[PDB]
Each structure stands twice: as C-alpha cells, then as structure tokens.
Amino acid sequence: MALKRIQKELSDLQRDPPAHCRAGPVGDDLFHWQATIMGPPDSAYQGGVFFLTVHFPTDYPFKPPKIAFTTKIYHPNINSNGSIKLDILRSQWSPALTVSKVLLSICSLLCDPNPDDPLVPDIAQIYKSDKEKYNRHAREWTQKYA
Amino acid sequence: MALKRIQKELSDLQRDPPAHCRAGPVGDDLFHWQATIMGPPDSAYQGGVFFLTVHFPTDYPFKPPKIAFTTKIYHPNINSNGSIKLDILRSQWSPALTVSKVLLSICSLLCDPNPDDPLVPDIAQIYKSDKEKYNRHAREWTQKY
Amino acid sequence: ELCPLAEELSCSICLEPFKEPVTTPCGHNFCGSCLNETWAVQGSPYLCPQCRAVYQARPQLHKNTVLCNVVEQFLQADLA
Amino acid sequence: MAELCPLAEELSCSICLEPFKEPVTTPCGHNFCGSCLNETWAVQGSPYLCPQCRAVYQARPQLHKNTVLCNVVEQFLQA
Amino acid sequence: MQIFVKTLTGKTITLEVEPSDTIENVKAKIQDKEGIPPDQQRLIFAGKQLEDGRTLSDYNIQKESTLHLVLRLRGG
Amino acid sequence: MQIFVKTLTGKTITLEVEPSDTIENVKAKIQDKEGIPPDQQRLIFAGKQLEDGRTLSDYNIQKESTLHLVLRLRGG
Ligand SMILES: [Zn+2]
Ligand SMILES: [Zn+2]
Ligand SMILES: [Zn+2]
Ligand SMILES: [Zn+2]
C-alpha cells in the first residue's frame, strides 16, 4: 500500500537532509510533494535552485511517481511544460528507487543529456552543433529562472 | 573436504544420540566406521541388534558412503553379503544427508521392504504370498543372527 | 546494537523487515508479496528491482526459509 | 553485535556443516555455499537436484551469491 | 499438542498439532517451515515410516514426541 | 584511503581503494558487495556522474568521500 512507503521515505528524509535536494508535501496530502534541487557545481546550472512537483500514484512504488519541473530550465530532455522524458520514470522504473535517489538521478541528467533522442529538438540541435552557445543559453536561463 | 565433514558429523553424532542408531570409528581411521542399529519395536526385528560397516569415499559427502550389514538379516533388499540395495546409497544420494539420517533410513526399510524389485528374489516371494510366514522367518533370524 | 542487522533485513520495496522473503537467482531478496506485486503489474521481461537482471519468463520462486528464520529471530532480539 | 545465539545453526550450510561461505540460494529457496553447490552439481550432472528438497532443474541454474545472507553471516562471525 | 521434528539438517523444529491430524497434514506444515514438498518427505517414528492418510493417533504419537525427517527413499 | 558508497537502498558501505583506481575498479568492488553489475551502476559525486576509465584523482575524490549509487539511466 502506497501511503506507508511515502510516510517512511518522508521521515527518513526529515531525519537526514540530503545535500542535493529538499523535498516535502505541499499540504495535508502526502501524495503531492514539492521538491527543490541544486544545480551541479561545475556546469551551466551553478548556484541554480530548481523547483519540482512530485505526484505519487495510488499504486506507488510499483508505478513510478510523476515528476516535473516548475522552474524553467534549458535542457534537451525537459520541455517548456517542465516534463522530464527519462527512462527511470517510465519503463526503467524500479520499486527499490526512492524519491531521494530519483531526484539525485535527475541532478546527474543535467550535465549528461541525450541529444540524440530529445524532447526539445531545437535545444538538442544547438547542443550538437555549438555546445558553447548551448552552455551560455543554459547559464543565462539559470540566472533568470525563465 | 571429506575428513572435516566426517569429524563434524561424528561430533554432532556424539551430542545427537539418535534412537535405534549408534555409530563411530572404532580405529583411528575415521573413513571406516562401525554402526549398530536396533530392530524397530513391535516388529519381527524387535530386540535385535544389527552391526554395519561404513566406508566413506574420498568425495564424501558429494558421493555416498558404502554401507553394508555384517549381521545376517532376513530381508528382500539385503542379501547374504550384507549388501543393501537402497536408492539413497546410489543415484538418489544427497550431499545434505548424514550417516545418522542414512542409518535411520535403513532402519525404516526393515519394516518397509520392496519385494517387487528385490535383491533376494525368493525371500521377496515369501513376503508376497505369505506375510505371516515372512514375519515368522524374520523373527527366527533375529534370534539366530 | 542490532542496527546493522536491522537494515540488512529490510526489504528494498516496503522499507520494512522481510515478510516471507524470496531470493532471486541474481541473489537479491524481497518480500514474497512485494516482488509478486512488482511483477504482476507488468509483463514482458521481468527485471530485478535491485540490479535489473533480465528474466524473459517470470521466475518461480519459493520463500527463503533460512532468511525467514533469521528475521523471526531478529524480531525477538529487537523486542527483548 | 549479535543478541542471537541460535543463529549459528541457521547460518550453517547443510553440506560442509560450517557457516555459509558466499551462499547462493536456489529457486526452491534453499541456501548453500557457492563452492559446495557447484561441487554437488559438477559431480551430479544431467538433471540437477537440490540437496534439501530434490527440486529438479534440467538446465544448471545460474545463481549469484545472496549478498544480504553474506552480510548476516559476516556480522555473526565478527562477533 | 506439541511435537518435535528433526529436520534433514539435524535442526529441531516445533509443530502444534492434534491426534486427529494426518501424516500428510504434518508434512504440509513441515513444508511451510523447511520448504521440502510432502512427496519428498519421509517421516520416521519408533524406527518405522509413517504412512500418509493415517493420523497421529493411529501411530500412538503423543505429546513431546520427536518425529525424524529423512528424504524419500525406495528399497531395491 | 577509505571511501564510502551510498548504495541503492540508502545503506552505506566502506571500500578500500586508491586515488589511482578507476571508476571501473570501484564498480567492481561495489558489485562484489551488492551484486549489481557495473553496467547497471551509475555513481554520482558532486551532482555529476562518474565515467569509466577515469581515476578517483580525475574527479578530486579523496579520503572519506561518499559516492552515491543510483541505477543506470538515459535521457529521452
Ligand atoms: Zn517488502
Ligand atoms: Zn538482482
Ligand atoms: Zn531446494
Ligand atoms: Zn557449504
């Protein structure tokens, strides 16, 4: 049953705050959370603070949670609606994964995108033909959060 | 390694004292054992004491030990040479079996023979056609040994 | 004093001590219910939750009785 | 530390009669030392049978060591 | 009613049964604890094997008795 | 020089390594303790993944550092 797993993840998350994120529910419903992750230290997302939404299904953790950015981010695998096209959030999901592990997995996605099968084609095209222009665009978007 | 497995079996067998089963090396060769099993109560073998010899192979426990009777016994699956035709002593052997379990298995075979695929055909025939005379014959050999 | 043993006997799916655990051929343990519920909501290749080992047919697994007895003895030590 | 004394018999292999050495678990749920089970099945080819329940395996099962069970045996021996 | 069963590995387990329970019912409870199917079990008491379909009372098995478990054998 | 690996289940294990050892060597030691193949391991340090072929000195990983283990992933 889903609620118990969510409760224990939250209590372990409160007992020890991981350095890479901060997560917690929005109100009374623990099936809806708000998370915030920090950008990698040596990248185009330095010092950035990115907010995300976590929505747990009723059959969690046997089905993956729906996770989407609310902060705007320049990335080939994250569209303007904040949707994240990532394998561990669909077919490659494992019930042994925790929200802390997924958020940390999303952190490593920022500096390791897949421009060959992208969610935003024009951003991936810039990444392949001019990575310097890509870095400045991502650096600029982190300063603006828009 | 076989010798450590044999020593651990004997060590547990000294705190085991299983019923109807006694075994242990008489000499200094732990690969050759002397065993005594008691005939099950309320049977043709009741009160009897049967001696057996256990010879462990070099591959023990991955190969079965060679166990044979020295006391003569009246049974369709045990011939006059003490040889025991038992499946767990051959193809149905398991490395998780110990000597205490095998001797106990042999004890339960006395009152549950297999006359249809026998080692002594004529004893099995008396068991098939006249089990009352069979029990009388087996009780006589128990007293005679 | 039984904390390293406690984490080692906790299921990676329900985050609780093992309840009738089963062991995959890849050597990973899960509650019989947790692993059954994982592979019931899907099909296709069945993947191990901890190492993603591929099983084209769903493996038929029975409960790790030794691991059951360990968890049962762990609960007694944790309660007294 | 181990507040558990009867754990010794539960952590002993049914073949070597010693604590488990890199135990593997068969699909039938029985544990053996990695070396003990491989020696059982290198000598017993053809259908491979479990030593504890005689579960039949036509093809030799590919088993990796039960890491949780290795950690329990190690914490038991270090105490 | 409490009885004891010496398992295949020499370990002793405890079962709570009744004289009405058959040998096949006992072998089912042994399967829950040890994971060996009843058709591979051979229970021994007083040097004799216990037949399936018969009850514990038929073999005069009383409280604190000790049954012994070996693997299924076949004489020849 | 000891490092720590935050395994997939949140558990922490200790590894005896050297600054010259590659990530492929580190995943081999992780495989020996957890049973997850290196191709399924994704090690994360300082928010970024650690690629095979590079050493611990290339990623500025020193004494008592903690690596984080997640499952292999790919963007889409
Ligand atoms: Zn579970
Ligand atoms: Zn696995
Ligand atoms: Zn088995
Ligand atoms: Zn062993």
Numbering used by the authors:
A (entry chain E): 1 to 146
B (entry chain B): 1 to 145
C (entry chain D): 3 to 82
D (entry chain A): 1 to 79
E (entry chain C), F (entry chain F): 1 to 76
What does the paper say about this structure?
TRIM E3 ubiquitin ligases regulate a wide variety of cellular processes and are particularly important during innate immune signalling events. They are characterized by a conserved tripartite motif in their N‐terminal portion which comprises a canonical RING domain, one or two B‐box domains and a coiled‐coil region that mediates ligase dimerization. The RING domain of TRIMs adopts the canonical RING domain fold that recognizes the ubiquitin‐loaded E2 conjugating enzyme (E2~Ub). To understand the role of self‐association and gain insight into the mechanism of TRIM‐mediated ubiquitination, we have analysed the properties of two TRIM ligases, TRIM25 and TRIM32, which differ in their domain architecture with TRIM25 containing two B‐boxes compared to a single B‐box2 in TRIM32.
The TRIM25 RING/UBE2D1~Ub complex crystallized with two molecules of the TRIM25 RING domain and two molecules of a stable, isopeptide‐mimic of the UBE2D1~Ub intermediate in the asymmetric unit (AU), related by a twofold symmetry axis. Rather surprisingly and in contradiction to our SEC‐MALLS, the RING domain is a dimer in the crystal with the dimer interface burying ~1,000 Å2 of solvent‐accessible surface. As observed in TRIM32, dimerization is mediated by two α‐helices flanking the RING domain. Similar to TRIM32, the dimer interface is formed predominantly by hydrophobic residues (L4, L7, L11, V68, L69, V72 and F76) that direct their side chains into the interior of the four‐helix bundle. Each RING monomer contacts a single UBE2D1 molecule via the conserved E2–E3 interface that has been observed in other E2–RING complexes. Similarly, in the TRIM25/E2~Ub structure each ubiquitin molecule is folded back onto its E2 in a conformation that resembles the one seen in other dimeric RING/E2~Ub complexes. Similarly, R54 of TRIM25, referred to as the linchpin for allosteric activation of E2~Ub (Pruneda et al, 2012; Metzger et al, 2014), is involved in electrostatic interactions with Q92 of UBE2D1 and Q40 and R72 of ubiquitin, and accordingly, its mutation reduces catalytic activity in discharge assays and formation of K63‐linked chains by UBE2N/UBE2V1. Instead, residues K65 and T67 of the RING domain contact D32 and E34 of the opposite, distal ubiquitin in one monomer, whereas in the other monomer, the K65 and D32 interaction is absent and replaced by a hydrogen bond between N71 of the RING and K33 of ubiquitin. A similar arrangement is present in TRIM25; however, in this case a charged residue, E10, located in the N‐terminal helix forms a network of electrostatic interactions and hydrogen bonds that stabilizes the observed RING/E2~Ub arrangement. However, the complex between the RING and the E2‐Ub conjugate crystallized as a dimer suggesting that binding to the ubiquitin–loaded E2 stabilizes the otherwise weak RING–RING interaction.
